[PDB]
Amino acid sequence: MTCDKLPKVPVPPLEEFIKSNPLQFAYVLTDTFDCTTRVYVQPARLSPNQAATALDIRGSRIITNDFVGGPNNSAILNNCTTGEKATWYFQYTNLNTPNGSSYCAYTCNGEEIAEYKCANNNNGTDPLQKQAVEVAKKVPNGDKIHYALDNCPEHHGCFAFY
Amino acid sequence: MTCDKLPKVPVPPLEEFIKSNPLQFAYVLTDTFDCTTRVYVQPARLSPNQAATALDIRGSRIITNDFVGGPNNSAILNNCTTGEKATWYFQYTNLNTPNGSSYCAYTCNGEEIAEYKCANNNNGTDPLQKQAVEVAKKVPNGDKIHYALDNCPEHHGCFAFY
Amino acid sequence: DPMTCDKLPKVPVPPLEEFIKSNPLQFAYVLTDTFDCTTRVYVQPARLSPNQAATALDIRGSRIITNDFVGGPNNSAILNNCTTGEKATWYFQYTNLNTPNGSSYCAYTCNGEEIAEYKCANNNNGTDPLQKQAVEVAKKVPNGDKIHYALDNCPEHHGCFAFY
Amino acid sequence: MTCDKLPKVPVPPLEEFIKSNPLQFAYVLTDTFDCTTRVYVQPARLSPNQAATALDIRGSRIITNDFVGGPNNSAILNNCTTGEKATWYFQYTNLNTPNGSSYCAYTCNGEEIAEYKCANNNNGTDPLQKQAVEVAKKVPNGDKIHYALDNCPEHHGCFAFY
Ligand SMILES: N#C[C@H](O)c1ccccc1Cl
Ligand SMILES: N#C[C@H](O)c1ccccc1Cl
Ligand SMILES: N#C[C@H](O)c1ccccc1Cl
Ligand SMILES: N#C[C@H](O)c1ccccc1Cl
Ligand SMILES: N#C[C@H](O)c1ccccc1Cl
Ligand SMILES: N#C[C@H](O)c1ccccc1Cl
Known part of the structure; x- marks a missing residue:
């Protein structure tokens, strides 16, 4: 019931996330x-630190964050544009089931939740996601x-991008 | 000697491209x-057509194109903002060698080249790339x-994005 | 250097007289x-105009698009499409009107963080160095x-320099 | 009583016409x-001939004519789309009074009037315009x-254009 107290499940291996690509945020x-x-x-071949990168794509705009594993099942995100850091956690993950992938992740401002992202590739049918939200x-x-997907721009022949 | 006569090598399996991610365009x-x-x-789980997508990322800007195989070792790109189609070919591919990945790809305006993209993840050291250019x-x-990588913006903690 | 549309420069809108003295211009980009x-x-606004809105005429052969405009906050102009009633908020990336080498400017309207429309105008065949960097x-x-580039393969003129 | 015998007043300076912009044709x-x-x-900065241009606007359509001074207080118009020429005169002008601007102009087919245009920006209140018509x-x-302004298309937020 406070942000600091939410669940922190293990971060799945990177390949599980890459196999889930692409996802959309429902909440x-x-x-x-x-x-x-x-x-x-995945990290670029020549990247010395080997940090992976999350791409958040909204139409023609992209936000990018490198991420690396931290303590207490955290990830530390590095905004590629800004240099700003945030500590993130997974409330749960459920990647690459026979009904697809879902997860909910969050970052805190002490006991408040600063940001929340629930991703899936199955139109929001995972029962885990319902209870987590x-x-x-x-x-x-x-x-x-x-809910993040209500009035979105119309597409021009691509399923996942617009 | 003219664009319509350039080499057209087989498009590698999608997995070889994903294993190469990320690349940058040298030329x-x-x-x-x-x-x-x-x-x-890769295509979204729920995409009926199962077209894969190319993401071209420059800072906060992204250009997106679904692509499918066509005749003569072509790829037909669908621009995700406009629905405009372009027919692309690979001049050569050399993915996932012990020295990394490279390729050069092009699209023609009859006998002229309209666009050219040479990608790698090894800072331009593939000898195939020099001869292709x-x-x-x-x-x-x-x-x-x-050469496409002079005087690009400075980074803020991420290797591959800015 | 600025990375999204909402972050582009917004220079002061020159007095309308500086634009009228620049007439006509063409869009290079x-x-x-x-x-x-x-x-x-x-x-300029019609004598009897209730709101004193000036008008931008965009002329392409025998077709025209018209927008009334008035000043808004943050160096904006709010445009009113005279045909549709559609409104849009415009800014100038830069203006360089009535120099010894003529006039140029670049203006834009945003769809949030993306650019929705862009218009770089001049009357000096695109020679202003500001216009290149802005684009x-x-x-x-x-x-x-x-x-x-907006001026390749345009229709042939019939004896007028600026209209066809 | 014959077109060739109508008054031909001096063409005012272009600045007087520009200061009157915009006008509408009442008759x-x-x-x-x-x-x-x-x-x-005004002529474009790079126009070699420095001819000014009259723009006749009707909704989304426009007729354009460069004009230059000729003998007998004439203006010679050059249609920018068709190349057609016509010799025009002013019956009177009354620009930029404290009650606004009016004028009446004409072109002849010998003794016949071929076209007539009375313009104002004062809702037709100049007594000169009544007597001229x-x-x-x-x-x-x-x-x-x-009268040219009876059943005109409805507007969408602009006073002088539709
Ligand atoms: N698979 C799937 C989802 O329907 C989806 C729709 C649009 C964009 C991304 C995604 Cl994952
Ligand atoms: N690996 C590698 C390259 O150096 C690189 C640098 C910057 C962005 C992308 C890439 Cl592939
Ligand atoms: N449309 C348009 C113009 O180029 C413009 C830009 C910015 C402010 C006003 C105007 Cl009319
Ligand atoms: N002055 C000038 C430009 O060359 C020009 C050419 C054609 C139409 C308009 C303009 Cl401003
Ligand atoms: N109204 C009118 C005429 O067509 C005209 C246009 C420009 C200059 C002179 C004249 Cl008479
Ligand atoms: N001022 C004035 C006139 O009433 C007018 C109305 C509509 C279009 C143009 C003009 Cl000048």
Whole structure:
């Protein structure tokens, strides 16, 4: 019921995320991540630190964050444009089931939730995702968590991009 | 000698491209693909057509194109914002060698080259890439082909994105 | 250097007289194909206009698109399409009007962080160095890859310099 | 009473016409210039001949004519689309009074009036315009001269254009 107290499941291996690509966010907190597709990328061959990268794609705009594993099943995201760091966790993951992939992740401002991202590739049918969203919405600031896919731009022949 | 007569090698399996991710374009024709990172994405689980997607990323800007195989070792790209189609070929591919990946790809305007993209993840050291560029530069419009990675924006903690 | 449309420069809108003294201009770079082969003429408000909105005329042969405009906050102009009633909020990336080498500017309207339309006008055959740097910057924002040179393969004139 | 004998007042300086912009035609002869707004444009900076241009605007359509001074207080118009020439005169002008601007202009087919255009930006209140029209109507073919602004298309937020 406070953000610091939410579940922290192990971060799955990178290949599980790459196999899930692409995902879309069904629920988010700030309207930044509305109408958004997530793609995970392995580190560049010549990258010395070997950090993987999350791509958050909204139409023709992309947000990029390198990420590396931290303590307490955290990931630390490095905004590629800004240099800003955030500590993220998974509330749960459920990748590459026979009904597809879902997960919900979050980052905190102490006991409040600063950002929330629930991703899937199965149109929101995972029963885990339903229960996770209910829990998150009761954490302080969680009232802003909303369905992210309601009035999105029309497509021009691509399924996952517009 | 003319664009319509350039080599057209078989398109590698999608897995070989995804294993190469991310790449950058070392040589391009127009200014569009300067300072750009390419990421290949598989089709969304629920996509009926199962077209894969090419992501061309330059800072906060992304250009997206679904692609499918066509005749004569072609790929037909569908621009995801416009629905415009372009027929592309590979001049050569050399993916996932012990020295990394490279390829050069092109699209024609009759006998002229309209666009050219040479990708790698090994800082331009594949000897195939140098010979391919020297050939393409001699095709009509090919004089515009240029090194694409001078004076690109500075990074903020990520190796492959900015 | 600025990475999204919402972050582009917003210079002060010059007095309308500076635009009218620049008439007519042509668009060298645009985003959609609507404003290819296009000449711009600025018109003061009609004497009897209730709101004193000036008008931008975008002329392409025998066709015209018209937008009333008025000043808004943050150096914006709010445009009112006279045919449709559609409104849009425009800014100037830069203006360089009435120099000893003529006039140029680049203006834009955003769809949030993407550029929705772009219009680089001049009357000096695209020689202003500001215009080159501006175009390069605007192309790099989301959707800016569509910005193109607008004056290739336009219809032949019949004896008028600026209209066809 | 004959078109060739109508008054031919001096063509005012272009600046006086530009200061009057925009005008509308209250009376015209043919159907062509019903529901029409007139805007005058100076020559382009790079025009070698330095001819100004009259813009006749009717919704989304425009007729354009460069014009230059000729003998007898004439203007010679050059249609920018068709190349057609016509010799025009002013019956009177009354630009930039404290009650706004009006004028009446004409072109002849010998003794007949071929086209007539009375412009104003004061809703037709200049007494000169009334007397001019009554005179022109008595010229051969002047029976066709009519009020031009009756059943005009509805507007969408602009005063002078639709
Ligand atoms: N598979 C799947 C989802 O339907 C989807 C739709 C649009 C964009 C991305 C995704 Cl994953
Ligand atoms: N590996 C590698 C390359 O150096 C590189 C640098 C920057 C962006 C992408 C790539 Cl592939
Ligand atoms: N459309 C358009 C113009 O080029 C413009 C840009 C910015 C402010 C006003 C105007 Cl009319
Ligand atoms: N002055 C000038 C330009 O060359 C020009 C050519 C054609 C139409 C308009 C303009 Cl401004
Ligand atoms: N109204 C009118 C005429 O067509 C005209 C246009 C420009 C200059 C002179 C004249 Cl008479
Ligand atoms: N001022 C004035 C006139 O009433 C007018 C109305 C509509 C279009 C143009 C003009 Cl000048």
